[PDB]
């Protein structure tokens, strides 16, 4: 790519869905988390959660494509079990049955999300990202890998 | 059909008339219950009941073609053993001695009923459909199967 990238932790290979695993040392500025997978052919929704601990009460960034109402993606945060105000991007960048690359880049003030190498959405941090130590992936997809790389 | 359909409960194959059997877990929004069969050559009436329990005292939706008075179909509900106001469609979409496909689609506000792939009647829910856990079929027909499907 246009930036030299270094591994920040060993890749997850063929992680089985639903997948939950550590983000070693927490999210950090300049970290890129890339998921390579396939949207199921009759997909309804899928979810990628960046969260603090295992119970899901505190999700810093929930990324939720919904193959509903013409296709849209919900971004939100959960705090102490409570969902905040949704940010809906009224566009579906995934296609049922098709491979995708999904990249989350941690910047100081926001996440940047790229889908198939193209910027899709930004999401301002609502909570401290460094407390996110867990990624959780679920729903109508499969994954071939999850990589963790830094500039 | 125009939409992919998936089994929700195994089919009842060649169920013997009169038939009564579970709708496992109750009727659900988006469930399509399809009866594939043949109207007897000399048919007087047949009945499909969506009901709460084996008793027959509470029938959410009673669908009753009558080969009488030109041919017509009665739709009604039974509560605590009492019939409500009938809804009569003054048309007979079944032909004596001929195959038919009869499909009940459960929607949020109504059942939609298709006969031979053409819309026949709507029936507003008078009671919650989810309490229906039993289907009962009787009268002048035979069935090759009953399927339970969803999108
Ligand atoms: O905000 C992310 C979550 O949305 C939840 O969906 C509901 C929510 O329960 C309620 O606010 C309602 O108004 O609409 C929302 C649809 O956005 C999902 O159930 C949950 O899985 C998250 O995606
Ligand atoms: O409403 C459904 C039931 O109708 C019963 O017959 C009715 C009849 O249609 C109506 O004209 C009224 O005056 O009296 C009857 C009530 O018993 C059938 O006997 C029953 O099988 C259902 O189809």
UniProtKB/Swiss-Prot annotation, chains A, B:
Disruption phenotype: Increased natural killer (NK) cell activity with enhanced degranulation, higher expression of NK cell activating receptors, increased frequency of intermediate and mature NK cells, and greater production of interferon-gamma following murine cytomegalovirus infection. Defective iTreg cell differentiation with impaired Foxp3 expression, reduced stability and suppressor function of iTreg cells and reduced frequency of iTreg cells but not natural regulatory T (nTreg) cells in lamina propria. Binds galactosides. Has high affinity for the Forssman pentasaccharide. Ligand for HAVCR2/TIM3. Binding to HAVCR2 induces T-helper type 1 lymphocyte (Th1) death. Also stimulates bactericidal activity in infected macrophages by causing macrophage activation and IL1B secretion which restricts intracellular bacterial growth. Ligand for P4HB; the interaction retains P4HB at the cell surface of Th2 T-helper cells, increasing disulfide reductase activity at the plasma membrane, altering the plasma membrane redox state and enhancing cell migration. Accentuated expression in liver and thymus of embryo, detected in embryonic heart, brain, lung, liver, and kidney. Highly expressed in adult thymus, small intestine, and liver, and to a lesser extent in lung, kidney, spleen, cardiac, and skeletal muscle. Barely detectable in brain and reticulocyte. Expressed in placenta, uterus and decidua during pregnancy. Expressed in CD4+ T-cells with higher levels in iTreg cells than other T-cell types and sustained high levels throughout iTreg cell differentiation (at protein level). Expressed in myeloid cells in lung. A beta-D-galactoside 1 binds at residues 49, 62, 66, 76, 83-89. It is found in: Cytoplasm; Nucleus; Secreted. The chain holds residues 1 to 180 of 353 of the full protein. This is Galectin-9. Contains two homologous but distinct carbohydrate-binding domains.
């Amino acid at each position: 790519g246009s930036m030299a990238l270094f591994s920040a932790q060993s890749p997850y290979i063929n992680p089985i869905i639903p997948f939950t695993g550590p983000i070693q040392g927490g999210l950090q500025e300049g970290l890129q988390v890339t998921l390579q997978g396939t949207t199921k052919s009759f997909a309804q929704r899928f979810v990628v959660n960046f969260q603090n601990s295992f119970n899901g009460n505190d999700i810093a960034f929930h990324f939720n494509p919904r193959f509903e109402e013409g296709g849209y993606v919900v971004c939100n945060t959960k705090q102490n079990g409570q969902w905040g105000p949704e940010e809906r991007k009224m566009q579906m960048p995934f296609q049922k049955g098709m491979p995708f690359e999904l990249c989350f880049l941690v910047q100081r003030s926001e996440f940047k999300v790229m889908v198939n190498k193209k910027f899709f959405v930004q999401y301002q941090h609502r909570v401290p990202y460094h407390l996110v130590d867990t990624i959780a992936v679920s729903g109508c997809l499969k994954l071939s890998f999850i990589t963790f790389q830094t500039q």
